[PDB]
């Protein structure tokens, strides 16, 4: 009846303008397809894949008093998402993303859209994870403050650092204070040192690396050498690859509740991955339950 | 009352500052403020008229949309009479990356058209009646309009932007219009196409912009085209975005005020000027007193 996985923060907007090209050559301007600014950011698709496979959830973040805001408080309200919107001056999460034929993504990330005073209040944590099993933190404030707090609480914690530089300080919180840690492998300068140092902090059970259609790489704890996943052939066209990492998130941690082994989760999570990247930002979608048990 | 009848271009732009343009593949860069704001070409030609000192009015489509809200309270905010025609397309919308040195790349969203959408005629002709000048943005149903505003005793200008001077869906505004302006950026022949909508349209003359250069005149009887040289802006160039629209502004002043065609390009380019020293972030156009010395 209550929470079984909290999501912390994530919650935002994405403008997809659908370009030609990668890297887009100068021009005073394109006439592209229809733009239509969506809720759908990382903590918003987390919380929608965990759901739509059957999970209690619940979203608790900062939000503006924005049309972005509005967007994202219809994205719930539309699939069914329990939501908590903070109060906040610095205004809703936003971004303007290019995306090329291919799929291929590049984002704008409003960096303006974080006010220090703001705050997830211990109470609501507690509440919220008085049954819960797991809370995922995204990486977005005031995600750095809840660390203490979730330390002590018998729940397994996640996190997504997704393009992580490797030495960026402002990470390190949620690094280094996570069971299970997520990011993309795209803007490290040392894939293997980086999921190394993760799991030398000794909290991180594993440490996933995904790389694209590729699939992407895994370190385990106690383990010397990196593991592989491989990618799975979406059953459409690839259209939009943005929100895939949340997508493979929520596909991971399904199995993982479930006691499902390693290999399992990775594969659920490589399966959830493909689907989302076959969905354009005209509509919200997340693979179900049936589908995703589908593959062997 | 009315002096200028605006018509088209209500829409809204949303700005994104990068390092650079072209802009390099990555998957994230961190950004400054992204605040999606009304000011697309109608939009500015409207304010910066007003903001002269000129009666205006602006008639356009506008979508039940968020963009509309922004649009509205735009017009409101600013004091431009305004009224907004339904539309089911939803109102016109782009995505522009600004680099430091103003130069912007726009991402047009060609969707935002309804076939069925008209100005009616009555909306039209009770907004002329006393209206000196019409301009008409390249928006749709822009192009269903011009055979009203041939038979009405108003001179007509038109703004072409980044023009092929070959698609044929801009023509029918090239060709009915007093003073035809547009963009060079996208010209393979910036001079055959000044003289070609001088010998097949009705144009008096016809202005082609350039930037930081100035751009490029020609005139009715003349043979050669005209050069303009541009004004240094008097504050850092952070968004060219408006410069174009407020070239026309300063132009119609001193236009619809009789003043020689050296004075009108020369309003035209300290406007476009002023124009790229303003933010996405505030809205902003050039007054009587700035302009005039
Ligand atoms: C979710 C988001 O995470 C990442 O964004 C982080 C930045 O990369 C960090 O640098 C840091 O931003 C700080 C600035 O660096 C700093 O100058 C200051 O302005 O404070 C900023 C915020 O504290 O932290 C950011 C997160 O808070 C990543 O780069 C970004 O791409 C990620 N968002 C993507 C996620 C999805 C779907 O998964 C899309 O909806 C978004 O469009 C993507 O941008
Ligand atoms: C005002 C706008 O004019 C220009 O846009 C025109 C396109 O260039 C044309 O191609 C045509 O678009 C049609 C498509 O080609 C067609 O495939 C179909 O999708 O229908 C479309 C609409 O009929 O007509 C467009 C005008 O509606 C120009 O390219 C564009 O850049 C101009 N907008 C700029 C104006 C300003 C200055 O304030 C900014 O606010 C905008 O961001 C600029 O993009
Ligand atoms: N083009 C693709 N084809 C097939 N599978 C893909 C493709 N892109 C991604 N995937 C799968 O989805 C996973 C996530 O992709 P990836 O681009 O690495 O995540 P991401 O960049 O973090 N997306 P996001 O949630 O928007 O930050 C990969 O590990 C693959 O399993
Ligand atoms: N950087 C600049 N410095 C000085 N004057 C400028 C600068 N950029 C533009 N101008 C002036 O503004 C005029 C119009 O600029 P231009 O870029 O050609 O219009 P535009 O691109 O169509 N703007 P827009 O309304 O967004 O379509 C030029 O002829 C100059 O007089
Ligand atoms: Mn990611
Ligand atoms: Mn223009
Ligand atoms: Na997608
Ligand atoms: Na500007």
């Given at each position: 009846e209550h929470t079984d996985v909290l999501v912390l923060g994530g919650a935002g907007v994405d403008t997809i303008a659908?370009?030609?090209?990668?890297?887009?050559?100068?021009?005073?301007?394109?006439?592209?397809?229809?733009?239509?600014?969506?809720?759908?950011?990382?903590?918003?698709?987390?919380?929608?894949?965990?759901?739509?496979?059957?999970?209690?959830?619940?979203?608790?973040?900062?939000?503006?008093?924005?049309?972005?805001?509005?967007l994202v408080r219809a994205f719930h309200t539309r699939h069914g998402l329990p939501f908590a919107a903070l109060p906040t001056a610095a205004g809703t999460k936003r971004?303007?993303?290019?995306?090329?034929?291919?799929?291929?993504?590049?984002?704008?990330?409003?960096?303006?859209?974080?006010?220090?005073?703001?705050?997830?209040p211990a109470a609501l944590i507690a509440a919220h994870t008085a049954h819960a099993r797991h809370v995922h933190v995204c990486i977005t404030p005031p995600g750095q403050h809840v660390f203490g707090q979730l330390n002590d609480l018998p729940v397994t914690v996640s996190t997504d650092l997704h393009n992580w530089?490797?030495?960026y300080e402002g990470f390190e919180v949620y690094a280094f204070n996570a069971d299970l840690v997520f990011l993309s492998a795209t803007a490290?300068?040392?894939?293997?040192?980086?999921?190394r140092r993760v799991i030398d902090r000794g909290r991180?059970?594993?440490?996933?690396?995904?790389?694209?259609?590729?699939?992407?790489?895994?370190?385990?704890?106690?383990?010397?050498?990196?593991?592989?996943?491989?990618?799975?052939?979406?059953e459409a066209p690839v259209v939009d690859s943005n929100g895939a990492g949340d997508?493979?998130?929520?596909?991971?941690?399904?199995?993982?509740?479930?006691?499902?082994?390693?290999?399992?989760?990775?594969?659920?999570?490589?399966?959830?991955?493909?689907?989302?990247?076959?969905?354009?930002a005209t509509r919200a979608g997340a693979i179900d339950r049936a589908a995703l048990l589908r593959p062997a």
């Open positions: 659908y370009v030609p090209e990668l890297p887009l050559p100068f021009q005073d301007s394109y006439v592209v397809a229809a733009i239509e600014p969506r809720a759908g950011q990382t903590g918003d698709n987390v919380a929608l894949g965990l759901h739509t496979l059957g999970l209690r959830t619940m979203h608790v973040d900062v939000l503006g008093d924005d049309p972005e805001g509005d971004a303007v993303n290019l995306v090329g034929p291919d799929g291929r993504r590049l984002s704008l990330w409003d960096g303006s859209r974080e006010a220090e005073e703001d705050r997830y530089d490797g030495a490290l300068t040392d894939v293997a040192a980086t999921m991180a059970r594993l440490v996933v690396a995904t790389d694209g259609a590729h699939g992407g790489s895994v370190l385990v704890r106690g383990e010397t050498e990196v593991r592989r996943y491989a990618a799975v052939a979406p997508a493979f998130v929520s596909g991971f941690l399904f199995g993982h509740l479930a006691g499902e082994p390693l290999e399992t989760c990775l594969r659920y999570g490589a399966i959830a991955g493909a689907y989302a990247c076959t969905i354009p």
